[PDB]
Design a protein around this ligand. Sequence first.
Ligand SMILES: CC(C)(COP(=O)(O)OP(=O)(O)OC[C@H]1O[C@@H](n2cnc3c(N)ncnc32)[C@H](O)[C@@H]1OP(=O)(O)O)[C@@H](O)C(=O)NCCC(=O)NCCS
Ligand SMILES: CC(C)(COP(=O)(O)OP(=O)(O)OC[C@H]1O[C@@H](n2cnc3c(N)ncnc32)[C@H](O)[C@@H]1OP(=O)(O)O)[C@@H](O)C(=O)NCCC(=O)NCCS
Ligand SMILES: *C(=O)CCCC[C@@H]1SC[C@@H]2NC(=O)N[C@@H]21
Ligand SMILES: *C(=O)CCCC[C@@H]1SC[C@@H]2NC(=O)N[C@@H]21
Lengths: 506, 506, 209
Amino acid sequence: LEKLEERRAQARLGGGEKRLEAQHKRGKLTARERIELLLDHGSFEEFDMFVQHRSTDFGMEKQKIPGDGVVTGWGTVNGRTVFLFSKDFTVFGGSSSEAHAAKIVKVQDMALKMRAPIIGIFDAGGARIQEGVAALGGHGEVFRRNVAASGVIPQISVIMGPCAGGDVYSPAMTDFIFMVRDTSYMFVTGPDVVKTVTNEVVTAEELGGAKVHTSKSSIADGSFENDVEAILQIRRLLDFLPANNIEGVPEIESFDDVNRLDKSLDTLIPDNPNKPYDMGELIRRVVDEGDFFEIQAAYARNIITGFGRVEGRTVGFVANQPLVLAGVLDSDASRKAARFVRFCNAFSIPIVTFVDVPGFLPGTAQEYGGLIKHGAKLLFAYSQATVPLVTIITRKAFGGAYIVMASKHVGADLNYAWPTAQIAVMGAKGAVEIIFRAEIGDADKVAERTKEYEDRFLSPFVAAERGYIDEVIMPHSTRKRIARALGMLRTKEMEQPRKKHDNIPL
Amino acid sequence: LEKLEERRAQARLGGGEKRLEAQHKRGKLTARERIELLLDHGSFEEFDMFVQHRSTDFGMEKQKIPGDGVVTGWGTVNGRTVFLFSKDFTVFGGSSSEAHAAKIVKVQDMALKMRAPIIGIFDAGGARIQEGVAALGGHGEVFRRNVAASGVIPQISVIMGPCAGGDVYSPAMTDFIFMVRDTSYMFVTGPDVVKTVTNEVVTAEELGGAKVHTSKSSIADGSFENDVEAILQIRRLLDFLPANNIEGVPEIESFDDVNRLDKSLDTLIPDNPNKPYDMGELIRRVVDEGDFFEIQAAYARNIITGFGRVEGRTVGFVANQPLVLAGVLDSDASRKAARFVRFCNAFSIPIVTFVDVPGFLPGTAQEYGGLIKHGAKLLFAYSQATVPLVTIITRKAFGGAYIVMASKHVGADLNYAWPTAQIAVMGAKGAVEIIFRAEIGDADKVAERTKEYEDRFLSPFVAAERGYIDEVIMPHSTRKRIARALGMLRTKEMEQPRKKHDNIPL
Amino acid sequence: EPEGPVAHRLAAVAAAIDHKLNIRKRGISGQMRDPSLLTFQRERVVVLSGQRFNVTVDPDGDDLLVTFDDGTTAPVRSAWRPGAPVWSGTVGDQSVAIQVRPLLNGVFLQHAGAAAEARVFTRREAELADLMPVKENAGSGKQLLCPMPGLVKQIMVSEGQEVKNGEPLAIVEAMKMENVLRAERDGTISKIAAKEGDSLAVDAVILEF
Ligand SMILES: CC(C)(COP(=O)(O)OP(=O)(O)OC[C@H]1O[C@@H](n2cnc3c(N)ncnc32)[C@H](O)[C@@H]1OP(=O)(O)O)[C@@H](O)C(=O)NCCC(=O)NCCS
Ligand SMILES: CC(C)(COP(=O)(O)OP(=O)(O)OC[C@H]1O[C@@H](n2cnc3c(N)ncnc32)[C@H](O)[C@@H]1OP(=O)(O)O)[C@@H](O)C(=O)NCCC(=O)NCCS
Ligand SMILES: *C(=O)CCCC[C@@H]1SC[C@@H]2NC(=O)N[C@@H]21
Ligand SMILES: *C(=O)CCCC[C@@H]1SC[C@@H]2NC(=O)N[C@@H]21
């Protein structure tokens, strides 16, 4: 019947032509256009197009809009099944009602049941005030499902407009949050309340924009220039990730050779111990085809985290970066690395770690901020892990930092070292000062003792003699060795002791 | 033979009588005196009394001290098996070496194997420099085992002297850290390097003293006046805790009655809503015999966390405290409550929660500091729990904060409310200003609308009509209800979905 | 920017690259049903630094055939592999080498002294991309603040000198590691506040354009 086509075409207009045009004028796409761009052509099946709200307070009974402000369903991305929901800002500001939340709950349940990923797209303003406590209940149920899915299916969130109030806690419990520059923001309490309570005058962008959440607050995993770019990059990310915690990583045919050498790496490390180099260069010369997907690039830039491929299989990478803060570990970097390691372990992704670390960041600000526990987080993550772990020391590895960065002693499978490695309890001069404390008066004698200590102990060979390092390798062979190791390690079988859950510091 | 008695007596002197008298002059006990005070009389069995070190560098072969700086063994506390180690500050400054670490590893392995608690007493200075890289290796083997035991057996740490460098990460991964005032301190990096790098001039007490770690940094769960008080309180605490994650909470015979009414509670809440009350008094009136062991008392005092008993069985308590920051939720309070809920759930301890919360703390400082994620931590911990949860709303419960505080929507078994409960999306003034914004010019209609909203919605009865509240009870019945419900809920049986582990935000 | 037969060539190459990658991408494991049951759209839109080309792509056995709106065709042949920095091959009876670099959702191409950013869409994706607005950068101004506390070890510029974006200006040392500060904008050096030997705190003034 043509009448059903009419009903459908009327549901497809949301909250009016003029609100849609106002959305296009801000530079934003609509909910349905976003879905259309994310999914493969012709694959989208929609749920609950005709659902309506049932509130009768404050005159709500006179405006019943089909769909109640959210679009829900499932489709395919590059042939693989995905579930999704997309909020509609033109329908009561995207606010969440009882029926709204019921739709979201339906798709969450289905995604967990069929063990497939779920993508949320956010543009909205929280609980619908007119529906009072009812609205809140809805939020709660959604929250519950998030927690149930944590570590079973990947959950991705994409902030493409306002996200205020309770809404924010749903993305917070997902594995990745991405944001669009200049049109999105997140906060718990808004500017007016900030003014009435704290007398601070701030705009929405200044309080909760993409810069703040990608560079200062730890919340976001990345930003993008506009909606189209963001969605295309989400398509890119999904092709790296497993569908669930059972099936393993996806595999594609590679154009690269796993037996190629790279002479350039033999010159990467400078002769001067105080000149830096770019670890990213090494990461991009090791991965297949130079392709690397960085996570939290703008935050805690003394450490690098991301995804690449070796032999057509997804691998995760963690590395110290000498260009920033001399590569020291601090609380921000430790948190950034710890959550990445935990995700990869949950979904059976192998991890490679490149180590060049002189110690931790000193000062009252680190200690009063809780560096003890924050740095314990990364140690916990690595020591808990049962996926393959491969580590490479290019340069300095001093003190407890050496233990933390995927050492043999916390459970790493293979540990290599370049010829330029310096594995020691601390630098030479400090060690000598402590050992020869009663004789720190003379000068030439101090230089002699320091020379001797450096010649004996600032090298890879004491570690090799004890078996803490499996092999000292030439730089130009790094890829060749990595690719071989990972292959052999694909059969690793290991388990932690039986428990409800660990008690990791928070 | 008398020669064996001689060898034993000699090993019992550590680094010398002079160093032990110096330890005493500082106001501190010796390691062996600490063991003697913790354990039941005659229960201590010591391991590895005669172990020595094997280093041959920097003249260390000529001072071989038996024990290598730690006393290890097992005994009983109030009849129940415990394992323990205690560092000896008189022997190489309590520094950690290979043999030292192996001693600690032995008792860690035994504690996990026999599923019993482990207590570590720290007075030391980290990796023994003269042993070099080997020392670090030892540290790693300890760290690993800490992680293996998390959530399987309770691990307690007692800091009774200096604790610096790599050492500090072992206590960090344990369940509780207690400190002795004026004689203990913890930091990753010491004042000398702080001065060299940052130009700050600070004392050890000012950098990592008990005040810092009990009131600012979130590291310590409590402090005590002296060694003796600390050790007696550790005995007390062990009497609350389960031995392992299977056996369940201990039981004692109670002197209280489960059917007594408390008329005082009928007048606890003041008529004036802008006036506070002490929630700790309600806690101390609901538990058996007024006995309550508070955790992290000096940190984030807007929230209360601790242990009591009901009908002779251990119960955990969480509550909002109106006397501090109007009882709002903030990042610090969120993390404090989250770790406690996680521990309780891991070890099968039921949780009772008291709710009086107006919302979250506003400001740029909270948002830039990551309140979104820090606040999600508590929601996550509650939504994951499978132990019994009982909740009582005394007063205000607004917005997302209502959801976070053990709401029916996040899986609470029983939810009660006092007659004074105000369960609503927000306050009346703000609700009307948002709803009736097109007529905000007037002032009389404003007050009329405000009063009608107040009367209709700021009460417990809409939540009761929807089934979100199981019963509106009288205050004087609170204990009587709790004790009954817990008794019924002992048989609860629930399971989260199958996974390696969750991906809770960090 | 490119114009005339040059631009065309570049456009064709872009299409080819896209095609190749897409083919590989459709062999991913774990799909719901078989990919042979899918379809590839022939009509494509190549956007080349603000210049659109409507094209049609067809696989000629092993090579590719790219048809434009003018009816003019171009066969494309090469053995390029993703990762190599030079695309060498033939585009319609002519041998060419293009310098290829990766770009977010596209490539950056250089040929015959011309350079262009190249993106390839379908019709619908292109019309949705045309809804996105062009944004302008704010632009740094007037200052060079020290982002890290440390010592000033060298200054390579002098007052009254002109610099171009990305040029080094000073070196700051902290925790035994140098740090090169580079110019973020083009301009002329007006003043120098600090010079070799002095310690600077975070967000301190080194110079002003
Ligand atoms: C989400 C938010 C940041 C967007 O602000 P904005 O872009 O300036 O736009 P508006 O305030 O015009 O919001 C768009 C519409 O959605 C409605 N809306 C927004 N948030 C809503 C919510 N939680 N409940 C119900 N309706 C809501 C608006 O009232 C408005 O509809 P209108 O066109 O009929 O007036 C802001 O509205 C907000 O804080 N909302 C959450 C609840 C709240 O506290 N709002 C008012 C305090 S300022
Ligand atoms: C733990 C610490 C904070 C306690 O400091 P303190 O109370 O002033 O006391 P001391 O430094 O005199 O320590 C007592 C002894 O332990 C020894 N010691 C301490 N830490 C040691 C370590 N890591 N390795 C070997 N010996 C160590 C000291 O040499 C000293 O020996 P002595 O009486 O024969 O001289 C401190 O010594 C320390 O920071 N040690 C770690 C190693 C280090 O970085 N030291 C340099 C700065 S102190
Ligand atoms: C020499 O000048 C000593 C300063 C360098 C010490 C550095 S700071 C970074 C590492 N942290 C630490 O504790 N020591 C190392
Ligand atoms: C009246 O003066 C309005 C401002 C006070 C509101 C308080 S601040 C603490 C709670 N958080 C919140 O958002 N509102 C409550």
